[PDB]
Amino acid sequence: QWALEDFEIGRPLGKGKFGNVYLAREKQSKFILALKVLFKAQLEKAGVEHQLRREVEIQSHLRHPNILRLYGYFHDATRVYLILEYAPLGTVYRELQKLSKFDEQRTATYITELANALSYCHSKRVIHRDIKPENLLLGSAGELKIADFGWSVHGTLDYLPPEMIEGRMHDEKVDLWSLGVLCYEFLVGKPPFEANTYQETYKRISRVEFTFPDFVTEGARDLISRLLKHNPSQRPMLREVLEHPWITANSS
Ligand SMILES: Nc1ncnc2c1ncn2[C@@H]1O[C@H](COP(=O)(O)OP(=O)(O)CP(=O)(O)O)[C@@H](O)[C@H]1O
């Protein structure tokens, strides 16, 4: 379909696992996009050549103002290139280092943008493992865009919920956990179950051992508490998140 020839490639936007993401421009149209290079090599030799074909396909056909568009793809000798919407304000990760914590307005805002993006994603039966802040890009007006592609129906642990590490059966509730983690991390500046070892983060996640710094408000504590429940069934539905004294008081 497309080829390396169709694009002027520019500066590096960052390094991924299996290659880098370049800034690029389609020549006939001068459309500005991102162009993700993944080497066939470290997909062959990591057992994922299968895995991405599925994520692409899932991604290939879903569309939402807060989900990163995949436009298309192609390949050459030993490289595969994906073709992405380009997010100019980078990752929420950098925004979080640059700022350390987020105020309640922006935090509630991002959680709204996410719930939406996710409830739409629920409406078509899709889900999310790698739902973490380095996988959250910011668009030209300042809005979230999920950029991790994420699965349908069957690693650092900070963002995994209990059900996925104790090896159990797991459903859309997984995303509810992620929002609690993401919410906590936006406000506090670090994930609720952070540790220095994989093996402690497990106990910490398994039991749901987290505490709040003094500066975190009764209303946030409540939402985060509702979201971070060991039993998945006990966690809310996304509409209850959206309509929540706190979210509602603080979003845009
Ligand atoms: N579409 C885009 N627009 C702007 N910047 C992007 C982008 N895609 C990627 N980047 C930048 O390049 C980095 C590497 O890409 P990406 O994060 O997708 O790699 P990756 O999936 O292999 C590892 P992970 O998903 O865990 O971060 C991103 O963290 C981001 O800084």
Swiss-Prot record:
It comes from the Eukaryota. GO terms for molecular function: ATP binding; histone H3S10 kinase activity; molecular function activator activity; protein heterodimerization activity; protein kinase activity; protein kinase binding; protein serine kinase activity; protein serine/threonine kinase activity. Highly expressed in testis and weakly in skeletal muscle, thymus and spleen. Also highly expressed in colon, ovarian, prostate, neuroblastoma, breast and cervical cancer cell lines. Changing S29R: In a colorectal adenocarcinoma sample; somatic mutation; reduces interaction with TPX2. Coiled coil: none annotated. ATP binds at K17, K36, E85, Y86, A87, E134, N135, D148. Changing Y198A: Reduces binding to MYCN. Induction: Expression is cell-cycle regulated, low in G1/S, accumulates during G2/M, and decreases rapidly after. Its EC number is 2.7.11.1. There is a cross-link at K132 (Glycyl lysine isopeptide (Lys-Gly) (interchain with G-Cter in SUMO2)). One of its GO terms (cellular component) is microtubule. The active site is at D130. Residues 7-247 form the Protein kinase domain. Changing F39A: Decreases the interaction with phosphatase type 1 isoforms. It is an enzyme of class 2 (transferase). Keywords: ATP-binding, Cell cycle, Cell division, Cell membrane, Cell projection, Cilium, Cilium biogenesis/degradation, Cytoplasm, Cytoskeleton, Isopeptide bond, Kinase, Membrane, Microtubule, Mitosis, Nucleotide-binding, Phosphoprotein, Proto-oncogene, Serine/threonine-protein kinase, Transferase, Ubl conjugation. Phosphorylation at Ser-206 decreases the kinase activity. Ubiquitinated by the E3 ubiquitin-protein ligase complex SCF(FBXL7) during mitosis, leading to its degradation by the proteasome. Ubiquitinated by CHFR, leading to its degradation by the proteasome. Ubiquitinated by the anaphase-promoting complex (APC), leading to its degradation by the proteasome. Ubiquitinated by the CUL3-KLHL18 ligase leading to its activation at the centrosome which is required for initiating mitotic entry. Ubiquitination mediated by CUL3-KLHL18 ligase does not lead to its degradation by the proteasome. GO terms for biological process: anterior/posterior axis specification; apoptotic process; cell division; centrosome localization; cilium disassembly; G2/M transition of mitotic cell cycle; liver regeneration; mitotic cell cycle. Its main location: cytoplasm. Activation of CDK1, appears to be an upstream event of AURKA activation. Phosphatase inhibitor-2 (PPP1R2) and TPX2 act also as activators. Inactivated by the G2 checkpoint. Inhibited by GADD45A and p53/TP53, and through dephosphorylation by protein phosphatase type 1 (PP1). MLN8054 is also a potent and selective inhibitor. Activated during the early phase of cilia disassembly in the presence of CIMAP3. Inhibited by the small molecule inhibitor VX-680. Belongs to the protein kinase superfamily. Ser/Thr protein kinase family. Aurora subfamily. Centrosome amplification can occur when the cycles are uncoupled, and this amplification is associated with cancer and with an increase in the levels of chromosomal instability. Part of a complex composed of NEDD9, AURKA and CTTN; within the complex NEDD9 acts as a scaffold protein and is required for complex formation. Identified in a complex with AUNIP and NIN. Interacts with FBXL7. Interacts with CPEB1, JTB, TACC1, TPX2, PPP2CA, as well as with the protein phosphatase type 1 (PP1) isoforms PPP1CA, PPP1CB and PPP1CC. Also interacts with its substrates ARHGEF2, BORA, KIF2A, PARD3, and p53/TP53. Interaction with BORA promotes phosphorylation of PLK1. Interacts with CIMAP3. Interacts with GADD45A, competing with its oligomerization. This is Aurora kinase A. The gene is AURKA. The chain holds residues 127 to 388 of 403 of the full protein.
